[PDB]
Amino acid sequence: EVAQTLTQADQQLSAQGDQVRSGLESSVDGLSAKLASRILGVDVNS
């Protein structure tokens, strides 16, 4: 029973992880801009 629960949870979480990867592809621009602003020492809009 532990093995079957493990495999079903594995497949479901892999599916939802791919879904969350699709979902999180959006906000990358803002985070990358924030990081570039922090490293450069001056905020850059792009």
Binding site: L13, V20, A33, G41
Partner: protein, 339 residues
Amino acid sequence: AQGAQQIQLMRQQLIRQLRTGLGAEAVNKAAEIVRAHVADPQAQSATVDRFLSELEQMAPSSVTSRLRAASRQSLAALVEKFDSVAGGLDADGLTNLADELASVAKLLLSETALNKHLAEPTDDSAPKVRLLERLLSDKVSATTLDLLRTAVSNRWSTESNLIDAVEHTARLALLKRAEIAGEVDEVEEQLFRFGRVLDAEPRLSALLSDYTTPAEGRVALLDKALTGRPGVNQTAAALLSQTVGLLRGERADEAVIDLAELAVSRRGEVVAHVSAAAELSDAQRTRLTEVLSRIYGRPVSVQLHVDPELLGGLSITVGDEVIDGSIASRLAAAQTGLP
């Protein structure tokens, strides 16, 4: 319970994997964004100015090595004697003295037996001095005789240190005549440029460093290949030719860099190899020199080493200590600092 725990562990394993992926793509996009923004020269200048401002807020710090005690002390004595001699000798006599000392040094290097006899530590100075006159009492001028007598009257941990000291004295004489000419900055720049090009051309440095071949051939090659050009200081070329002629078991570009370091140390400065991402401005150059002097106290001579990979800031390195303001270093830190 362990099964549910395994579910939770795998869940957060996936969460960590997704976080790593998001961080990687975010830092890659940030690298691209900074690369796009840093193309403008105004961005270069702004980054350098910000790094200068950061340095000005940096709290001031406070802190040849291969010579042992006896050799180092004897070298100190030899340079002490040389300064007194050269002060009265003046520039033309300095030229003659440097040439004579270089010839004496190459003779000593050639005659291993004579080097060993003059190098073995001894209590007394009368025998060594007496042999010095018996060898070259009249061949070379009095100043060279006095300097050589002082050199051999002291103690050296190893015989090679004697030849090193004589070569150092000759280099000091050439540098002193350059100072008399007043074009010291010119020779500094020429020596650093020659060191840079020799380093960038390891084939030529290796060919010169082959001391097995005759010295005359190597010096002729250097004259008619690299150091002989219309835009070359005569004294810097003379120094380079002297060091290569006397070179033995030493990296050529390293020898040139040592000449440059000694030349800057003549006035007490400290060489700071500042590697910026673009040519600096006069105001920026002066500000950088002043801030480095304040941080390290002693006056600093800044040598610029332009490079594109730096992307900004200044990757200063002085005295085995580095202040790495490089933007590329910041990108590396951002990438590697991710979970």
